[PDB]
């Protein structure tokens, strides 16, 4: 969610 | 580290630097991949070329790993492969779903 939600 | 051998694997330099350094370059679909403090998944720093006046849009994605070949690495809920680079290739060789998909390997 935090890391550029792929 | 096959990853570190690609034109996108940036050292321990968090995506912030990859993004900061990469975003500054302004490479359409410029990407990179670094190992997050949680050396479990690989973080890919990508930069997309935007026409708007606000400037291009660059983004990074942490490669999600799994326990199923090839659905091992994935930076999306369906893009799982035993090769981040391949997946990297997939992140562009296939429609994709992230900033103009993987385009240029701007390995910080």
UniProtKB/Swiss-Prot annotation, chain A:
Regarding tissue, the record states: Highly expressed in spleen, thymus, and peripheral blood leukocytes.
Post-translational modifications: Phosphorylated after T-cell receptor activation by ZAP70, ITK and TXK, which leads to the up-regulation of Th1 preferred cytokine IL-2. SYK-dependent phosphorylation is required for recruitment of PI3K signaling components.
Q: Where in the cell is it found?
A: Cytoplasm
What does the record give as the function of this protein?
Adapter protein primarily involved in signaling pathways within T-cells, as well as other immune cells such as platelets, mast cells, and natural killer (NK) cells. Plays a crucial role for transducing signal from the T-cell receptor (TCR) after antigen recognition leading to T-cell activation. Mechanistically, once phosphorylated by the kinase ZAP70, mediates interactions with the guanine-nucleotide exchange factor VAV1, the adapter protein NCK and the kinase ITK.
Q: What is known of its domains?
A: The SH2 domain mediates interaction with SHB.
Assembly notes: Interacts with SLA. Interacts with CBLB. Interacts with GRB2. Interacts with SHB. Interacts with PRAM1. Interacts (via SH2 domain) with CD6 (via tyrosine phosphorylated C-terminus). Interacts with FYB1 and the phosphorylated form of FYB2. Interacts with 14-3-3 adapter/YWHAZ; this phosphorylation leads to YWHAZ proteolytic degradation. Interacts with VAV1; this interaction plays a role in TCR-mediated cytokine production. Interacts with AGER; this interaction plays an important role in AGER-mediated pro-inflammatory responses and cytokine release.
Query: Know the name of this protein?
Result: Lymphocyte cytosolic protein 2
Gene name tied to this protein: Lcp2
Curated annotation (Swiss-Prot), chain B:
Q: In which tissues is it expressed?
A: Is detected in the thymus, lymph node and very faintly in the spleen, but is not detected in the liver, lung, kidney, heart, brain, intestine or testis. Expressed in T-lymphocytes and mast cells. It may also be expressed in natural killer cells.
Report the PTM annotation.
Answer: Ubiquitinated.
Q: What induces it?
A: Through a myriad of surface receptors including the TCR/CD3 signaling complex, coreceptors, or chemokine receptors.
Indicate what this protein is called per its UniProt record: Tyrosine-protein kinase ITK/TSK
Domain comment quoted from the record: The N-terminal PH domain allows ITK to be recruited to the plasma membrane by an activated PI3 kinase. This domain also contains a proline-rich region (PRR). The adjoining domain is a SH3 domain, which binds to PRR (from itself or from other proteins). Next, a SH2 domain is required for binding tyrosine-phosphorylated substrates. In the C-terminal region, the kinase domain is required for tyrosine phosphorylation.
Explain the purpose of this protein.
Tyrosine kinase that plays an essential role in regulation of the adaptive immune response. Regulates the development, function and differentiation of conventional T-cells and nonconventional NKT-cells. When antigen presenting cells (APC) activate T-cell receptor (TCR), a series of phosphorylation lead to the recruitment of ITK to the cell membrane, in the vicinity of the stimulated TCR receptor, where it is phosphorylated by LCK. Phosphorylation leads to ITK autophosphorylation and full activation.
Encoding gene (name): Itk
| Free-text disruption phenotype from the record | Mice display decreased mature thymocytes and elicit profound defect in CD4+ and CD8+ T-cell development. Additionally, they show a strong decrease of cytokine production in response to TCR receptor stimulation. Impaired TCR-mediated calcium response in gamma-delta T-cells. Loss of Vgamma2-positive immature thymocyte-specific transcriptomic profile, although there is no change to overall transcription factor expression levels. Not required for the generation of IL17A expressing gamma-delta T-cells.
Subcellular locations according to the entry? Cytoplasm; Nucleus
Domain SH2 residue range list = 8-106
Q: Can you state the subunit structure given in the record? A: Homooligomerizes; this association negatively regulates kinase activity. Interacts with PPIA/CYPA; this interaction regulates TCR signal strength via a proline-directed conformational switch in ITK. Interacts with THEMIS. Interacts with FASLG. Interacts with VAV1; this interaction is important for VAV1 localization and TCR-induced actin polarization. Interacts with TBX21.
Which source organism does the UniProt entry give? Mus musculus (Mouse)
Q: List the disulfide bonds.
A: none
Question: Its family?
Answer: Belongs to the protein kinase superfamily. Tyr protein kinase family. TEC subfamily.
């Amino acid at each position: 969610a935090d890391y550029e939600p792929p | 580290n096959n990853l570190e051998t690609y034109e996108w694997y940036n050292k321990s330099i968090s995506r912030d630097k990859a993004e900061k350094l990469l975003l500054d370059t302004g490479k359409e679909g410029a990407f990179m991949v670094r190992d997050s403090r949680t050396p479990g998944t690989y973080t890919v720093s990508v930069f997309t070329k935007a026409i708007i006046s606000e400037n291009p849009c660059i983004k990074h994605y942490h490669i999600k790993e799994t326990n199923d070949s090839p659905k091992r690495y994935y930076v999306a809920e369906k893009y799982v492969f035993d090769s981040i680079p391949l997946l990297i290739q997939y992140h562009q060789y296939n429609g994709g779903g992230l900033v103009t998909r993987l385009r240029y390997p701007v390995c910080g």
